[PDB]
Amino acid sequence: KLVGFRFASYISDYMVLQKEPAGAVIWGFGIPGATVRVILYRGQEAIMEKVTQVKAQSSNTWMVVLDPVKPGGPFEVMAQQTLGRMNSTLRIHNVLFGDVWLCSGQSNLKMTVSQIFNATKEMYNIAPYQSVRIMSVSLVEAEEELEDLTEIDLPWSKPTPGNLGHGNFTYMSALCWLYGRYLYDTLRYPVGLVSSVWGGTAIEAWSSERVLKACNVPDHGYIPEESVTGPREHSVVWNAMVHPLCNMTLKGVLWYQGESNMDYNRNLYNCTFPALIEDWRQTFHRGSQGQTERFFPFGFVQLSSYLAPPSPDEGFPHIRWHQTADFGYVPNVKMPNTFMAVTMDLGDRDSPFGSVHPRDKQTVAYRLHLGARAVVYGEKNLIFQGPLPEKIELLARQELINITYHQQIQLQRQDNKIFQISCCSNHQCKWLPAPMSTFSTRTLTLNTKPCRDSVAAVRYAWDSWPCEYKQCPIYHPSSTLPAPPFVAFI
């Protein structure tokens, strides 16, 4: 109905488009049946040209896929609209080509540069990162999937101190920006960061109907008040803030979510999250006409610490577990081409926003940058996963449990209460603290004395607030990566 020739909403000046091998997609609206010519200029020279015609059927859209472009810039992109004796031209300037990353999640990734530690110096450190272009999607929800973005908080723009730290939970994600900054330090070519994030949302709002069907999520349509403070309805956030973007070619996705699922559909998270990334991969693949990799990188953050009221069953450790598909590490078979950052040891007790919103986002960006370099940018043989036990065995006569880790381990502190084992007597189990007894470069021996001989399972770091800041027991000496939490059965 709106027949005004225009680019898509997220196509503006200063943007970053996807680089070779993938081809950037340029689409917009116009008059049905009119002809559209999209020309890419390097300076004043027209490097390339594609031709298409605006759909005469329902969509009312015109779309071209450019040829692979080499990272760099600046470029210009022009679209010309012609029909009969009617002529129109659109031009966007200072376009760059490089790796585009989509950041989404809830309030912890909404947190801005102005809100984190060392805020001012990070805010004003942009001089070497002017080719790290940024955009923040405004909060909109919709009952049905949308073809275009309704509302944009921060259009494509070069980073400045003001737009980096532009308020409380507003413009630029500290995590997204810092991660893109590490990425630019490494890659040294243009990076684009599009952040569409809504605080206090459950993963159901971010998933389409397909994931809900695949995981048999209860079709309440609504979600317990306190658990989630944002849009309850299913898939609305996805419909209005992520679906329109799936026609943009992007390098990868950064994801920080799970806090709102601690007490809502907890036990289905190990289904929904892998299903979510898979559905996003497929939908972006078809939306960009195959330009986005069908298995594009999906880097995510494991939930951080949280000072929580005492509870018999805490959701946070369960969600930390389910975020790995109950496997303890990524990438794994259920999540190929994915990297993770463990953040439970980066707890902030005195944060003004809450224990759940720690201000140390630089360390998170560093660990995510390790994961990305290893999994995505061919920096193999770089330690990006924390020490995880390859072998667990039980010595019933010695009343011990011998655990051996794949990587060498280094002891930062002993915690009698961090290791817990389950005591199933009369076939009724009970979780009890198991103190560490012996330690070695690659193995440690736990003690069973409090549980007699009915041992069934062990678990490590299964508390919402497991340790104090950067003070967890087990660490890698070289990589400064913490031993991730886990549960194992005997």
Ligand SMILES: *[C@@H]1O[C@H](CO)[C@@H](O[C@@H]2O[C@H](CO)[C@@H](O[C@@H]3O[C@H](CO[C@H]4O[C@H](CO)[C@@H](O)[C@H](O)[C@@H]4O)[C@@H](O)[C@H](O[C@H]4O[C@H](CO)[C@@H](O)[C@H](O)[C@@H]4O)[C@@H]3O)[C@H](O)[C@H]2NC(C)=O)[C@H](O)[C@H]1NC(C)=O
């Ligand atoms: C509070 O926040 C500020 C702002 O971010 C931090 O200060 C920056 O910290 C980063 C990271 O330490 C510094 O970046 C490093 O700079 C070194 C040289 O930078 C100078 O020289 C280059 C030209 O060579 C100039 O372009 C640049 O502007 C600087 O003048 C690099 O050598 C570093 O890279 C390598 O270092 C290690 C090895 O030691 C490698 O392992 C790395 O992978 C990497 O390859 C790095 O790029 C930056 O210079 C700091 N200053 C500013 C103004 O940003 C504070 O650290 C932070 N403080 C606290 C307490 O949180």
Ligand SMILES: *[C@@H]1O[C@H](CO)[C@@H](O[C@@H]2O[C@H](CO)[C@@H](O[C@@H]3O[C@H](CO[C@H]4O[C@H](CO)[C@@H](O)[C@H](O)[C@@H]4O)[C@@H](O)[C@H](O[C@H]4O[C@H](CO)[C@@H](O)[C@H](O)[C@@H]4O)[C@@H]3O)[C@H](O)[C@H]2NC(C)=O)[C@H](O)[C@H]1NC(C)=O
């Ligand atoms: C994604 O993650 C979720 C949560 O981790 C998984 O859902 C649970 O998975 C576990 C393990 O597969 C299931 O546990 C089974 O529970 C049975 C009884 O359940 C009752 O008791 C528990 C607690 O006591 C209550 O919470 C529950 O509501 C019921 O009242 C046990 O009988 C099972 O054990 C039997 O078989 C095993 C097989 O080896 C023996 O070792 C045991 O001794 C015993 O004979 C088992 O413990 C649990 O039922 C699942 N649901 C819930 C709500 O907890 C998903 O499976 C997981 N999905 C994927 C794909 O990873």
Ligand SMILES: *[C@@H]1O[C@H](CO)[C@@H](O[C@@H]2O[C@H](CO)[C@@H](O[C@@H]3O[C@H](CO[C@H]4O[C@H](CO)[C@@H](O)[C@H](O)[C@@H]4O)[C@@H](O)[C@H](O[C@H]4O[C@H](CO)[C@@H](O)[C@H](O)[C@@H]4O)[C@@H]3O)[C@H](O)[C@H]2NC(C)=O)[C@H](O)[C@H]1NC(C)=O
């Ligand atoms: C960017 O890439 C994405 C990739 O998905 C594309 O998104 C697709 O957009 C179209 C919109 O045209 C979506 O298709 C629409 O689905 C409607 C509802 O489907 C459900 O409900 C119907 C009955 O209610 C069932 O039959 C069906 O099986 C589903 O269960 C259809 O009703 C739509 O057709 C009707 O809508 C238009 C209104 O615009 C009418 O004018 C038509 O005449 C027709 O009656 C339509 O098919 C599609 O679902 C989206 N993809 C996905 C995966 O969901 C974008 O199109 C693409 N953008 C560009 C510019 O290329």
Ligand SMILES: *[C@@H]1O[C@H](CO[C@@H]2O[C@@H](C)[C@@H](O)[C@@H](O)[C@@H]2O)[C@@H](O[C@@H]2O[C@H](CO)[C@@H](O[C@@H]3O[C@H](CO)[C@@H](O)[C@H](O)[C@@H]3O)[C@H](O)[C@H]2NC(C)=O)[C@H](O)[C@H]1NC(C)=O
């Ligand atoms: C960004 O947010 C911080 C944190 O505040 C908390 O989180 C926000 C998301 C909101 O939900 C806030 O309602 C919430 O408290 C803000 O810090 C707060 O700053 C204000 C003003 O500087 C402080 O208010 C005053 O505090 C003095 C104490 O000396 C009282 O006497 C006054 O009457 C008045 O209440 C407030 O204490 C402070 N809160 C915390 C927890 O530190 C911050 O202002 C905000 N910044 C911007 C730019 O919006």
Ligand SMILES: *[C@@H]1O[C@H](CO)[C@@H](O[C@@H]2O[C@H](CO)[C@@H](O)[C@H](O)[C@H]2NC(C)=O)[C@H](O)[C@H]1NC(C)=O
């Ligand atoms: C716990 O398991 C580890 C792992 O095997 C044992 O350490 C091994 O000890 C043998 C002794 O001959 C060495 O040859 C291996 O090289 C050791 N492995 C490693 C990784 O160091 C350890 O002895 C076991 N401890 C107990 C009490 O059973």
Ligand SMILES: *[C@@H]1O[C@H](CO)[C@@H](O)[C@H](O)[C@H]1NC(C)=O
């Ligand atoms: C549209 O106008 C521009 C500038 O006047 C011109 O270069 C172009 O050839 C025109 N296209 C038509 C008339 O189809």
